């Protein structure tokens, strides 16, 4: 028979195999569409969630009940020290898909970066790219390098740049800079690829990629919550006190006759640590890091035109379970997926 | 049953020249070219005569629905000729009981904004089928003129602005509002 009293279903199927993510670092599953017209630039960057705080601001949406009223507002800080572009990488369009084509790397690559090409740096002789960077200091190679580029200049449709973080600069314990491909959307493929060739071994700071008051999309892996029961996982109803075998369950799995249980029925498994792609996180601020001229310029961070104190965003006694954010940072409105120290795309 | 042959003529006049590449009548003359492919109709377009004076459309072994194209092709060819020679001018008056229908072309005859229909804040921007050009009329007050060579493109573009101006959720017996097509004509009579 039917269900007496309707209700919506618990959860959404459009997120599942509610499984422990395969990746740690959040993949950009789809970059935006390049056009022609507008200059080359990266489409994304890589950060580290330090923590959170309030912000106060005037708010100018006419019509509201909050118009030119101050509000408080949550933000995240994302420690986002400048990236280094190490490699480039061309993609060719095909009827199968989007085949990767021709990957150049720079002459020098930092150990920060080379770490990531080993499970175990302590043990490793550290021999990666040794026989490659030879190319960058002879005639024969340097000619092949040009042909390797000029091939991409003819064929490839999409060119992303490889970069890596500057793990060095973060308080975080790990030394293994995350690598990443980051897509260059801009002018023609040649122009694109020339821009990348200029950027090789070079810094790329946050401001170059994102601007203030700009909606971005955070991607990152959820805060992980081990195995969990159907109740905390799917937010199904707790059964009532009297319930002889368990009450944090789902009474009936399925009906009788399609006599399997379905994927659509709420079961118990991994809660959290999924891969997730949030969208529309505004950027309330992009802070310049610490630096010097004669003494420090710590002021410039948490300072405003209406505070003008000497504060850093670093709260008293450091960001908790993190450290001092000394570098430049983005201050998204709201929460972002995932936990302190997490690599946040 | 099958019918051993039906066929029909079209007197092309001396003002016009017509060709045909295969089954693809091309008509040019005063106002310009007008092509039309009839791949999809399965006929023998015999253009014949010195001075190329007439098109002729055969149809061998036609069953009822097959034969009926024969004429329709021919008819489309007249209307091609007509537009080349004369042009099409679809006049459409605006009709309203209260809110006057403010029209204003934009690019040339391409865009048509249509403000204050029924007092609606929403303005109906209506592009044309390319090849046509709307304009506003002088002499007659609430009245557009859609001039163009291709009958189809004109009429379609008319309809578009006929249909834009409909009323939702009210009784259209009563609420007789909009642009509607008053007269189908030509750009010059002869």
């Amino acid at each position: 028979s039917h269900r007496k009293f309707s209700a919506p279903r618990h959860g959404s199927l459009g997120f599942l195999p509610r499984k422990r993510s395969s990746r740690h670092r959040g993949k950009v599953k789809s970059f935006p569409k390049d056009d022609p017209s507008k200059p080359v630039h990266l489409t994304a960057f890589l950060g580290y969630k330090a923590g959170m705080t309030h912000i106060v601001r005037e708010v100018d949406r006419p019509g509201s009940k909050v118009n030119k009223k101050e509000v408080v507002e949550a933000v995240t800080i994302v420690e986002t020290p400048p990236m280094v572009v190490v490699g480039i990488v061309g993609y060719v369009e095909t009827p199968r898909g989007l085949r990767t084509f021709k990957t150049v790397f720079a002459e020098h690559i930092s150990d920060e970066c080379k770490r990531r090409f080993y499970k175990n740096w302590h043990k490793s002789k550290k021999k990666a790219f040794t026989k490659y960077c030879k190319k960058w200091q002879d005639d024969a190679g340097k000619r092949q390098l040009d042909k390797d580029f000029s091939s991409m200049k003819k064929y490839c449709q999409v060119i992303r740049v490889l970069a890596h973080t500057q793990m060095r600069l973060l308080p975080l314990r790990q030394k293994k800079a995350h690598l990443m491909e980051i897509q260059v959307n801009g002018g023609t493929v040649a122009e694109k690829l020339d821009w990348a060739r200029e950027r090789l071994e070079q810094q790329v700071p946050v401001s170059q990629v994102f601007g203030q008051d700009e909606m971005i999309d955070v991607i990152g892996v959820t805060k992980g919550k081990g195995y969990k029961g159907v109740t905390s996982r799917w937010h199904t109803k707790k059964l009532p006190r009297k319930t002889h075998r368990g009450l944090r369950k789902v009474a009936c799995i399925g009906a009788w006759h399609p006599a399997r249980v379905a994927f659509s029925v709420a079961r118990a498994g991994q809660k959290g640590y999924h891969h997730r792609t949030e969208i529309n996180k505004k950027i309330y601020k992009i802070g310049q890091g610490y630096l010097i001229k004669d003494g420090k310029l710590i002021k410039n961070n948490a300072s405003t035109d209406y505070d003008l104190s000497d504060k850093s965003i670093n709260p008293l006694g450091g960001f908790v379970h993190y450290g001092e954010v000394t570098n430049d940072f983005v201050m998204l409105k709201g929460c972002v997926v995932g936990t302190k120290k997490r690599v946040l795309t | 049953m099958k019918t051993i042959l039906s066929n029909q003529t079209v007197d092309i006049p001396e003002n016009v020249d017509i060709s045909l590449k295969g089954r693809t009548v091309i008509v040019k003359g005063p106002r310009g070219t007008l092509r039309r492919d009839f791949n999809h109709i399965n006929v023998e377009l015999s253009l014949l005569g010195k001075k190329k004076k007439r098109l002729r459309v055969d149809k061998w072994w036609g069953n009822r629905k097959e034969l009926a194209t024969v004429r329709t092709i021919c008819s489309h060819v007249q209307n091609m000729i007509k537009g080349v020679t004369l042009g099409f001018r679809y006049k459409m008056r605006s009709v309203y009981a209260h809110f006057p229908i403010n029209v204003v072309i934009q690019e040339n005859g391409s865009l048509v904004e249509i403000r204050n229909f029924l007092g609606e804040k929403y303005i109906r921007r209506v592009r044309m089928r390319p090849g046509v050009a709307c304009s506003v009329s002088q002499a007659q007050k609430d009245e557009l003129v859609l001039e163009g060579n291709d009958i189809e493109l004109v009429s379609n573009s008319a309809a578009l602005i006929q249909q834009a101006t409909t009323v939702k959720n009210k009784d259209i017996r009563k609420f007789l509002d909009g642009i509607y097509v008053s007269e189908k004509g030509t750009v010059q009579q002869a």
Partner: protein, 199 residues
């Protein structure tokens, strides 16, 4: 030893039939430019008929289910596999001889590629009937790589034009060369036209 058929202008299940039977006799067959293949009956009709097939799926665990390929290559290969004994070893062995393609890629772009006339639209449909192009049908049903296939194939046809042009030039040279030479080859060429060539 290999059959390369230009899938273009065939009838989906008509060509499949021939291919199946060939493939089971041990002929390595390659079909190619499947998206050209065209299915009898009008489009809307067939889109609806694909949309049935997408409605089909195991309730409890769709993931196990009838695997609705969207790519017009696969779609052809599915309909051959419906005309094979594919659970057996011999049916799966056969199916490993069939090779199919979305458009026509490098090993067979430069191959004289056959046609089966018994599968051919221009032979088997009456000319007053409608028919889907598979390409369209795939497209609307979820296939991605239409444009990519198209835009590679423009680049194929341009390259082929050139090949053909240059062929034409050699053929013209041959014709001229025979006319230059004729008198010193007369008492061969004669014999080839007494035993039935050249005429």
């Amino acid at each position: 030893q290999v059959l390369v058929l230009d899938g273009r202008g065939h009838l989906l299940g008509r060509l499949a039939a021939i291919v199946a039977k060939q493939v089971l006799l041990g002929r390595k067959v390659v079909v190619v430019r499947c998206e050209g293949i065209n299915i009898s009956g009008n489009f809307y009709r067939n889109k609806l008929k694909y949309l049935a097939f997408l409605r089909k799926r195991m309730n409890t665990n769709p993931s196990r289910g009838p695997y609705h390929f969207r790519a017009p290559s696969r779609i052809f290969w599915r309909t051959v596999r419906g005309m094979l004994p594919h659970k057996t070893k011999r049916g799966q062995a056969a199916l490993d001889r069939l090779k199919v393609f979305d458009g026509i890629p490098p090993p067979y772009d430069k191959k004289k590629r056959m046609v089966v006339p018994a599968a051919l639209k221009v032979v088997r449909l009456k000319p007053t009937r409608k028919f889907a192009y598979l390409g369209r049908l795939a497209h609307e049903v979820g296939w991605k790589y239409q444009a990519v296939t198209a835009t590679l194939e423009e680049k194929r046809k341009e390259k082929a034009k050139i090949h053909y042009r240059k062929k034409k030039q050699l053929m013209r040279l041959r014709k001229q060369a025979e006319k230059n030479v004729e008198k010193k080859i007369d008492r061969f060429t004669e014999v080839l036209k007494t035993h039935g060539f050249l005429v």
